[PDB]
Structure formats: C-alpha cells, structure tokens
C-alpha cells in the first residue's frame, strides 16, 4: 500500500449519519478512507454518482509550476498537456483526506492544435519516471489546457466549461479513466490487489471571471470499468454526452420534473454521472521542491516556440547563476531530465548522487558532485560557447 495509505489506516478521523455536513465547507464526496470507515460502524448494472473520492485535493506547490506550464498556450494559442509529477500526502482540512502535491509538470511529445490534442508516444517516458522516482516523485495525474481568447484587449478567456455545458468532455472522461486504469491504486478489499486510481485530471480553462482557473477531476470507478472493456464511446456533436455500445447493458438514474427516480438507456450518457470533482489549491505557504530561477532553464519539448534545451541554453543558464548556491541552480526537474537524457554528454551513469542531493536538499552533497569529473567536462563544454 502507498505510504499515505499505511498512515491513514492508523489515524482517527472524528472530532455515521450526519457526518457529511460538519467538517465543512460543502464537500461533494467522502474521502476514500472515510467512506471505508463509514462502512465499519467491478468488471463487465447501472450508473450511480459515486459518493467517495480517491483524491480530495490537488495542490500545486507554487504558482510558478502552473504559470510556466501555461506559457506554451500563451505563446502559441495551441492546447497543451503535461503529466503532474509529485507525491501523495494528507489533506488536513478533511479527515482521512488524500492530497496530491504537484512538484513539476512534465511536457511530453504531443501535437497541440487550437481545438485538438494528440498524445504521441514518449520514447523517454520510462526513464523520466526513473528520474522522478529518485527525486521522491511519481505521476499523480495529467493536466491539459482548453483556453480560447475572448477579449483580446482585456486579455481574457472564454468561460466555456460551466454549468450549462460540461466540465469534462466524454472524450476526456474516457481518456481520464484509461489513465486511471493504467495507474491503479493498491488496496486489499478488491478481487485483484487494486481498487480505483489516484490519477487525477487537471483542466486549465476560463472561469466565470474570464481569467484562467484550474479545476480537478477524477472519473468514477464505474467509468473506469466501461472504458477498460471499451464499452464507452464519446459523441460527435455534443461534448457533454457519452454513449454505451452493443456486449453489456448499462444506464443511469436521472430525476424528472415532478421529482421521482428514473432510469433510461445510456444513449447518450450525460457526462455528469461519470465525473468526480476534486478541489484545486494554491497554498498560502508555498512549497519549493525545485528552485525558482528568475530566468529558468527551458522546459522540454518546446521546439514549436523556439525554446530549446541544449548546451547553449545550459551555458547561458549556468553563467547567470555563478553566484547562486549550486544546489539551487541544479534543483530543477527540467534541467535534470536534460542533464540525464541529452545526446551529447548524458549523465545517466553518475546521476544518482546528485538526484539524492536535490531530493534531500543537501548542499554539501551537491557541492561534492559539482567536483565530479563528468560535471567538470560539462563545464569545459559550456565554456566553449560564445
């Protein structure tokens, strides 16, 4: 079981009927452990809205992690996506609540259009997890963008994802659940060794003020199943509607206009039944796993806008930080991927020590690594840039 789970099992969560309405603000779903305890005193029927959440809060470590992700869309107008790398911790506002801390957003190979997004295969996918594991990190979810300008004088964006439309398209529900399937969460009471997923979906769109806001979703554990056996399709005309194919028979329970229980063929399936709302947070005490440079090293895969990771930008970057503490200079997830996977002087052989120095924020350890032979020749290479 995950480190957070071994801990939440060992912690009291009180202060079974009126529980849902005391530890307020208004919570939409019970936390996974509490709904577990609210019961101690899944393959291919029907679709009911899920009363529990595997993750209760998504928290970006600081505004900069999210800001820099968004520059891709600002500079291009193209939708962009990334993977959330980080860790799972306790959400102390909610008893037994699970928090997803986002330390870094990794931007993999993709094709972004104004109205479309394609997820190419990442030849570095595996090695990036390997680097991320050694930095105390794992994928906690994915984030994608859906920003369209509205007022080009104000600099604002359409509030297109709202109560009268959708929050998640059916296409993104199927994608979300797929991701949840490939990132299962580990628990005993499930006939496989795993129940659910802790993989979250972040959405950058216009909010009601036509500024950018960040919203968090997971998809129901039922929804997980229908896509796992490919029983769920999206709809061409309307983003708010799924569709069940024909293989088993499912449907949902609405309520009509004199207020009684109902049941109708999922033809279509209103996305609202599949969606699990997670709250989204920027903390007042910000967190700096990675360092914030005034002039950061470039984010990866930014060909299409003329930001490139190469030994010219590293020469530049390194020369702007001669007076900076070396650990602060090097504590950057995107620098580190480049340092490990570049095709000129890769450092995959002698990384471990440095990545340990970044993960534990150890200065003396990083300083000795700066005296490594492979860093000296890295510096010999940079100094030949003019």
């Amino acid at each position: 079981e995950d480190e957070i789970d071994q801990y939440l099992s060992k912690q009291d969560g009180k202060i079974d009927e009126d529980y849902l309405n005391h530890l307020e603000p208004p919570v939409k779903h019970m936390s996974f452990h509490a709904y577990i305890r609210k019961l101690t005193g899944i393959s291919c029927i029907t679709l009911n809205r899920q009363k529990y959440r595997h993750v209760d809060n998504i928290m970006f470590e600081n505004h900069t992690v999210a800001d820099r992700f968004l520059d891709f869309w600002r500079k291009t107008g193209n939708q962009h996506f990334g993977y959330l790398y980080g860790r799972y911790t306790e959400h102390k506002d909610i008893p037994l609540g699970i928090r997803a801390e986002v330390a870094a957003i990794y931007e993999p190979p993709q094709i972004g259009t104004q109205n479309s997004l394609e997820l190419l295969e990442d030849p570095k996918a595996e090695v990036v997890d390997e680097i991320a594991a050694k930095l105390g990190l794992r994928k906690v979810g994915w984030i994608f963008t859906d920003l369209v300008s509205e007022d080009t004088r104000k600099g604002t964006v359409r509030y297109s994802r709202n109560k009268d439309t959708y929050f998640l398209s059916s296409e993104e529900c199927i994608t979300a659940g797929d991701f949840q399937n490939k990132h299962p969460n580990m628990c005993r009471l499930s006939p496989d060794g795993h129940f659910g997923s802790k993989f979250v979906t972040a959405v950058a769109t216009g909010g009601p003020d036509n500024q950018v806001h960040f919203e968090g979703y997971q998809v129901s554990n039922q929804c997980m199943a229908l896509v796992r056996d490919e029983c769920l399709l999206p709809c061409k005309d309307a983003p708010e509607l799924g569709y069940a194919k024909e293989v088993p028979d499912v449907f949902y329970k609405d309520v009509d206009k004199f207020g009684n229980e109902i049941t109708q063929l999922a033809r279509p399936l209103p996305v609202e039944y599949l969606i699990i709302d997670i709250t989204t947070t920027f903390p007042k005490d910000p967190v700096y796993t990675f360092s914030i440079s005034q002039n950061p090293f470039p984010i990866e895969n930014r060909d299409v806008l003329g930001e490139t990771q190469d030994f010219h930008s590293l020469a530049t970057y390194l020369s702007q930080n001669t007076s900076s503490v070396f650990l602060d200079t090097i504590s950057d997830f995107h620098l580190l991927l480049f340092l490990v996977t570049n095709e000129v002087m890769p450092l995959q052989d002698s990384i471990s020590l440095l990545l340990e120095a970044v993960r534990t924020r150890n200065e003396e350890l990083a300083q000795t690594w700066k005296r490594s032979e492979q860093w000296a020749t890295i510096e010999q290479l940079c100094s030949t840039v003019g």
């Binding site: 997820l119 190419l120 296409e171 199927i174 994608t175 797929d178 709809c235 061409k236 569709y243």
Partner: peptide, 16 residues
C-alpha cells in the same frame, strides 16, 4: 446524439 468519433490518444475540443 450521434456518437462514433473515437480513437484513444487524441482529444478534440468541440467548439460550436
């Protein structure tokens, strides 16, 4: 209403 339009790995943002 109409459905078929899907291959995984590719999201489309329906505008109108």
């Amino acid at each position: 209403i109409p459905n078929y339009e899907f291959k995984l790995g590719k999201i489309t943002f329906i505008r109108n």
